[model samples]
Target: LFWRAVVAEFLATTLFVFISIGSALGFKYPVGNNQTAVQDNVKVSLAFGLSIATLAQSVGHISGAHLNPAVTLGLLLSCQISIFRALMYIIAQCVGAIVATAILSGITSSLTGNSLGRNDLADGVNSGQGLGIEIIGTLQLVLCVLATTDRRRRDLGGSAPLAIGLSVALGHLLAIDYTGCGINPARSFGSAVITHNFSNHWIFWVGPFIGGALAVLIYDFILAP
Candidate 1:
């Protein structure tokens, strides 16, 4: 059972990264004239949000489909999962992300312009600002995950995944220009490892972990019934 859950996490995260990062590469290397900021953000947002929803629907039953390491950490801090299981899930998620991005880089060699879609502090954004943006964005996402998955609330049925996915998109819409919106450390690490671009990488992990811890506390203690 434990190994099955780990494999499920791995498979779900791989699909999540493949679809989401592939969309990002496509946005960065669009065929024709470059899109406006709004257009590009919207497209990438939808792709990530929809891909998350699809993967959740496909694998949520098996492992709860915590495709993002941040989500796993949130669940861990909330006492919703055992420490061993949480660590295993995080490892699987990170491995899945790395494998997926490696495959994406290979297939989209020309399209990605040799880039692996690593997240970095955007132009004019300092490290402090970037970290703040990542924290805020990840807080929103982790809050949404807690709310949607809270068994105390009335069941969302099939809509839970959609709600969580939209939360991800909303965060991206707000912070895409801040630090490319890396709410998931696994996603950021995978690309960074592949591209050898570790600029501000610590911000991605540190911000999201802090955000997840805070979100878990706020939701479990303050909000949930």
Candidate 2:
């Protein structure tokens, strides 16, 4: 059972990373001379959000399909999973992300002029703003999760993934400028590891973790209660 679960996590995370990162990298540095002034943050976000939603519908039952560490953490907080399981999920997710990045590095040159979608806040975005943006992004994301997966909302069946995916996109829409929307620790962690760039990694970890925890608390104790 444990191995099955881990394999599921691995497969799901790999797909999530490959598609999301691949798409994101596509926009950050499109083909030769295509690095236009207007970058496609919205498009990248949609690509990620839709990929996740589609996979959730396909394999969420097999592994809970937590493509993000934030999601796993939030689920753990909700008592939906054990700490051991959460840790295993994180390990599996990290492995998947790293593999995705390695594979992406190989093909990126072929597609996007050797540019990677390594997300980071621009110079104008300070830690304070980045943190705030991440917090809010996570809050919206967790809230969407709670509403969709909570036993009370089962009547909405089959639509949870769509809601969660939309919320994910919405966060990117607003927070990409501030922090490149690093609300998912796994996303940032994997990209950094693959790109070998460590700039502002702490912000990605601290901001998203804090936001996810707070969101879980709010939903479990205040709103859902």
Candidate 3:
């Protein structure tokens, strides 16, 4: 049963990244200068949002569908998952992300010059600014996850996945231009490993981890039942 949950997480995360990151590269790489910011934002956001909702519904029973490392960490800190289970989930999520990126790299190599939808700070965005955006974005996302997934909130669990997906889309819409909006460390790590571009990667991990930890503290202590 434990291994089943781990593999379920792996498969769910793979599907999540393959659809969301793949859609991102689908538009970002080919369109390049020709792509309108509004168009890419709308399409990519919907792609991620819809894919997450779908995956959650598909595998939520198996592994809770915590596809992001930040989400798993938040749950761990909140005492919702055992340390062993959380660690396994995080590892499976990262591995799944890497596999998804490799698949995207192979498919897009000829089409987009080997791009794998890696996240990075945009031009004119300094390290501090990027980190700030990532923290804020991840805070919003993790907060939604905690609130919606909290079993105390009887009205939230049923629609938790959709709400969480919307939160993710909102974060992307707000921060995509600032730092490519890497709210999930697994997603960032996968792309960085695949593209061999580790520039400012720590920001993605640090900012989100901090935000997630804070969200867990806030939700489990002050807010919900």
Candidate 4:
């Protein structure tokens, strides 16, 4: 049963990275002309969000589909999962992300100017604001996760995974222009590893982890209690 969850985590992250990163890398909607910037941003945002909603629907039954380490960390700190289980999930998640990205890089190319969508400080934004943006994004996301998935609630409406995915999209919409939206460390790390681009990578980790960790506390202790 435990191992089933691990593999689910593995494949879920793999496919999430595969689909979502490809949305950014493989599909380059021409931005050379016109005012389609709104639509273009929506394109990537929808890809990431809808992919999560779908993947979570696929793996939520098996592993709860905690594809993001930020999500995993929130659950871990909340005592919702064992430490060893959390470690295994993190390992599997990162491995899944790396493998998917490695495959993506192989299929795509630098010759075509395809990037792995690695997180970076967007133009004019330093790491300082970048961290705060990531923090707030992951903070909102994990809070939604914990609240929606809370066992204490018996009358929740709509799909928890869908809500989570919407939060992911919402975060992406807000931050993609700032930090390329690094609410998931595994996502950032996988792309970084594949592209060998470690430029300002720590913000992804520190920001998301802090935000998620903070969310778990705020939800479980302060808000819910």
Task: Sort the candidates on lDDT, descending order.
Answer: 4, 1, 3, 2
Instruction: Note the Cα lDDT for every prediction shown.
Output: 0.79, 0.77, 0.78, 0.80
C-alpha positional error of residue 193 in candidate 1 after TM-score superposition, expressed in Å: 1.1
Candidate ordering by TM-score (highest first): 4, 1, 2, 3
lDDT, candidate 4, 15-92, per-residue tens: 888888777754554542454433366788888888888878889878988898878888887756897888899999
- lDDT of candidate model 1 versus the reference: 0.79
Question: Which residue ranges in model 3 land beyond 4 Å of their true spot?
Answer: 28-39, 108-116, 151-154
- Point out where model 1 deviates above 4 Å: 28-39, 108-116, 151-157
**How does candidate 1 fare on TM-score?**
0.88
Task: Summarize candidate 3's per-residue lDDT along 1-225 as a digit string, tens digits.
Answer: 889989999988887888877766666555446764434467877887778887888898778888888878877777568978888889999999888878876663434333347777656888888888888888888888767744653576467778888888788789865677788888888888777666567898899888888777777788865
The numbered model that scores best in lDDT is 4
Model 2, 1-225: lDDT tens per residue? 676878787888777888877666565555556574456577777887888788877777678777888877877878568978889888888788888777777663543322356677676778787788898898888888877765663376667778788888888778765676788888888888866766567888888788888988887888875
Which tens-of-lDDT digit does each residue in 1-225 have in candidate 1? 779989998988887888887776666554546573334567887887888877788888788888888878887877568978888889999999888888876553444333347777646888888888888898899888877755745577668888888888898889865677788988888888777665467998899888888887787888865
What would you estimate as the lDDT of candidate 3? 0.78
Better of 2 and 4 by lDDT: 4
What TM-score against the true fold does each predicted structure earn? 0.88, 0.88, 0.87, 0.88
- Kindly report which residue stretches of model 4 are placed more than 4 angstroms away from their true locations once superposed: 29-39, 108-116, 151-154
Model 2 RMSD in angstroms: 2.9
